[PDB]
Scaffold this active site. Sequence first.
Site, PDB file in Angstrom:
ATOM      1  N   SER A 196       0.837  -1.238   0.000  1.00  0.00           N
ATOM      2  CA  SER A 196       0.000   0.000   0.000  1.00  0.00           C
ATOM      3  C   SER A 196       0.846   1.251   0.000  1.00  0.00           C
ATOM      4  O   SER A 196       1.675   1.418  -0.934  1.00  0.00           O
ATOM      5  CB  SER A 196      -0.949  -0.037   1.203  1.00  0.00           C
ATOM      6  OG  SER A 196      -2.102   0.719   0.871  1.00  0.00           O
ATOM      7  N   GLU A 323      -9.040  -6.045  -3.799  1.00  0.00           N
ATOM      8  CA  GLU A 323      -8.454  -4.857  -3.174  1.00  0.00           C
ATOM      9  C   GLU A 323      -9.515  -3.904  -2.614  1.00  0.00           C
ATOM     10  O   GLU A 323      -9.317  -3.301  -1.550  1.00  0.00           O
ATOM     11  CB  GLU A 323      -7.580  -4.128  -4.193  1.00  0.00           C
ATOM     12  CG  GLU A 323      -6.361  -4.940  -4.650  1.00  0.00           C
ATOM     13  CD  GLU A 323      -5.218  -4.858  -3.653  1.00  0.00           C
ATOM     14  OE1 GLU A 323      -5.419  -4.260  -2.566  1.00  0.00           O
ATOM     15  OE2 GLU A 323      -4.126  -5.390  -3.948  1.00  0.00           O
ATOM     16  N   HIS A 436      -7.472  -6.676   0.439  1.00  0.00           N
ATOM     17  CA  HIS A 436      -6.306  -5.816   0.597  1.00  0.00           C
ATOM     18  C   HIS A 436      -5.605  -6.062   1.929  1.00  0.00           C
ATOM     19  O   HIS A 436      -6.233  -6.016   2.992  1.00  0.00           O
ATOM     20  CB  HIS A 436      -6.751  -4.351   0.508  1.00  0.00           C
ATOM     21  CG  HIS A 436      -5.638  -3.367   0.675  1.00  0.00           C
ATOM     22  ND1 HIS A 436      -4.793  -3.018  -0.360  1.00  0.00           N
ATOM     23  CD2 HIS A 436      -5.240  -2.640   1.749  1.00  0.00           C
ATOM     24  CE1 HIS A 436      -3.919  -2.123   0.071  1.00  0.00           C
ATOM     25  NE2 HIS A 436      -4.170  -1.874   1.347  1.00  0.00           N
TER      26      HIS A 436
HETATM   27  C1  LIG Z   1      -6.009   7.697   9.324  1.00  0.00           C
HETATM   28  C2  LIG Z   1      -7.291   7.158   9.994  1.00  0.00           C
HETATM   29  N1  LIG Z   1      -7.278   5.709  10.240  1.00  0.00           N
HETATM   30  C3  LIG Z   1      -6.916   5.249  11.596  1.00  0.00           C
HETATM   31  C4  LIG Z   1      -7.062   4.774   9.139  1.00  0.00           C
HETATM   32  O1  LIG Z   1      -7.102   5.159   7.962  1.00  0.00           O
HETATM   33  O2  LIG Z   1      -6.797   3.389   9.335  1.00  0.00           O
HETATM   34  C5  LIG Z   1      -6.609   2.534   8.154  1.00  0.00           C
HETATM   35  C6  LIG Z   1      -5.547   2.736   7.232  1.00  0.00           C
HETATM   36  C7  LIG Z   1      -5.396   1.875   6.104  1.00  0.00           C
HETATM   37  C8  LIG Z   1      -6.329   0.844   5.996  1.00  0.00           C
HETATM   38  O3  LIG Z   1      -6.185  -0.063   4.851  1.00  0.00           O
HETATM   39  C9  LIG Z   1      -7.400   0.553   6.817  1.00  0.00           C
HETATM   40  C10 LIG Z   1      -8.419  -0.633   6.673  1.00  0.00           C
HETATM   41  C11 LIG Z   1      -9.272  -0.691   5.377  1.00  0.00           C
HETATM   42  N2  LIG Z   1      -7.591  -2.002   6.714  1.00  0.00           N
HETATM   43  C12 LIG Z   1      -8.483  -3.232   6.902  1.00  0.00           C
HETATM   44  C13 LIG Z   1      -6.563  -1.967   7.803  1.00  0.00           C
HETATM   45  C14 LIG Z   1      -7.539   1.445   7.968  1.00  0.00           C
END
Ligand SMILES: CCN(C)C(=O)Oc1ccc(O)c([C@@H](C)N(C)C)c1
EC number: 3.1.1.8
Length: 527
Positions: A196, A323, A436
């Site tokens: 990513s 994704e 993803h």
């Molecule tokens: C900045 C705000 N916050 C805490 C955030 O953006 O957390 C994320 C960041 C990337 C991400 O891919 C995901 C989810 C879809 N994943 C399943 C981990 C959450």
Amino acid sequence: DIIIATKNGKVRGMNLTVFGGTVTAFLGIPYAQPPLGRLRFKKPQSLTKWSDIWNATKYANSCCQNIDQSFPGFHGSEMWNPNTDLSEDCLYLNVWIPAPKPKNATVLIWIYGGGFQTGTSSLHVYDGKFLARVERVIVVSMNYRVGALGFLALPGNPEAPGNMGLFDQQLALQWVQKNIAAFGGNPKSVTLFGESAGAASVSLHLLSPGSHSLFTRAILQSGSFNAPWAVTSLYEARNRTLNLAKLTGCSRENETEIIKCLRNKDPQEILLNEAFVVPYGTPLSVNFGPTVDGDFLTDMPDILLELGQFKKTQILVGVNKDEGTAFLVYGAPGFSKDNNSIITRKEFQEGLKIFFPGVSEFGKESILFHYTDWVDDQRPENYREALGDVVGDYNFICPALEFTKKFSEWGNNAFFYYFEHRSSKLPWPEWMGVMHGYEIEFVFGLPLERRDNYTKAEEILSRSIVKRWANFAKYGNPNETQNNSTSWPVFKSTEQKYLTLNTESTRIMTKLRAQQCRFWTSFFPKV
Ligand SMILES: CCN(C)C(=O)Oc1ccc(O)c([C@@H](C)N(C)C)c1
Ligand SMILES: *[C@@H]1O[C@H](CO)[C@@H](O)[C@H](O)[C@H]1NC(C)=O
Ligand SMILES: *[C@@H]1O[C@H](CO)[C@@H](O)[C@H](O)[C@H]1NC(C)=O
């Protein structure tokens, strides 16, 4: 006992038992002066020597960042949350060395993702001990600053020049260059790999003259700088720096005064207002990200790619089958991890307004036109599947393929993968498929633990991927030569062959998402 003398002082590691063998781990070596005080928002400064023995026996602090609290107590989200103390003092790195100490081991340097707003090198799924034991490579990973502490941009002004977190990564790459031989590593055989925002970061190190001589090869998992979420424009970077100033009562005249004002705000107050600098946000919203700064990035990266201005070397690039799905439960109306999320045409259209915020009515109509003319118009999952396909193609697959075409057009070998296996242990619902982020555990060889409830087929898939990644790092060629495997052809701009990764059937295919990516990369950017 294991103590290594580095250019800046001695450090002691710890022995780990792995698969009836031994790995030597150096967790939390510092690689920069802590970016505290008047050093907040500036480029990382070099480390002054120490006389004692640094104890590198536990992960260091994660960098300050907002946490995902959308699913408290759910392992699917919380496995990504920081697992060490947050702190501004977080510029540390980890080193996994095989035991016994290698002679000239190839080095794999991991750059975590997290949208440039979250992430930490200490996550369980980034544990480098399996790769060091199984393949006898050295694994390095680093913490770099994220969010506004890492990418606040006043372009030109050295108090907040932008791309600081990228410069954190770069300084860690220098550290490996100057020190990894002490650990038995080859500074001339260094492979960066990253998922990513980490993969996007790897792609930007390919573009950055200051990084040309710090690594050999590059692996890009579900990310590249030309992804729509990956580079903040200097316009919006400015609006966002200013908006953040107003929300913190730091509006000033002398732009440098804004920075000094923000340098006396508490990390938490900076963090809690970070979220609001954009109108509405999703994890694909990258409020404070890489910027064209004239230092790390000398020009708009799309131009550098187009015109062959990048480090000539082999790349390994890939994406997962679904994704897009993970991001739908962070805002798409009618989606949830706890139903099967059958959405209607009108929910689909609402979903587009969330994932394409400033796109015209017509832009959104063309998306729906291309993705919503079905075979059986009655299949209830139609709109649910199409929204996931839209988000993944637009944010991941087409940029990855576009990056790989343009990169390979300048002569270098490139290998493209399509990761198609959904983890047997995956805690998210079935409708999100091959999500993803969920190739990472296979790359780091977690399924090689028989003790861990992965199927036997998953152990084999991980074993092969680990060998291909290692052979790619060591030899520039991601083939598994012994166990009679499908050969992985180079991706060339005409045939565009790619390799599928799965438990069943490792196939060679061509022209991934050909129809959809003509929409996204040719037509859509005009709207
Ligand atoms: C900045 C705000 N916050 C805490 C955030 O953006 O957390 C994320 C960041 C990337 C991400 O891919 C995901 C989810 C879809 N994943 C399943 C981990 C959450
Ligand atoms: C490092 O760890 C060892 C534990 O064996 C301890 O004796 C030593 O005091 C530690 N050093 C520092 C600086 O904490
Ligand atoms: C490691 O590789 C480099 C590559 O040129 C070589 O100079 C060196 O002799 C090798 N071995 C050691 C122990 O450094």
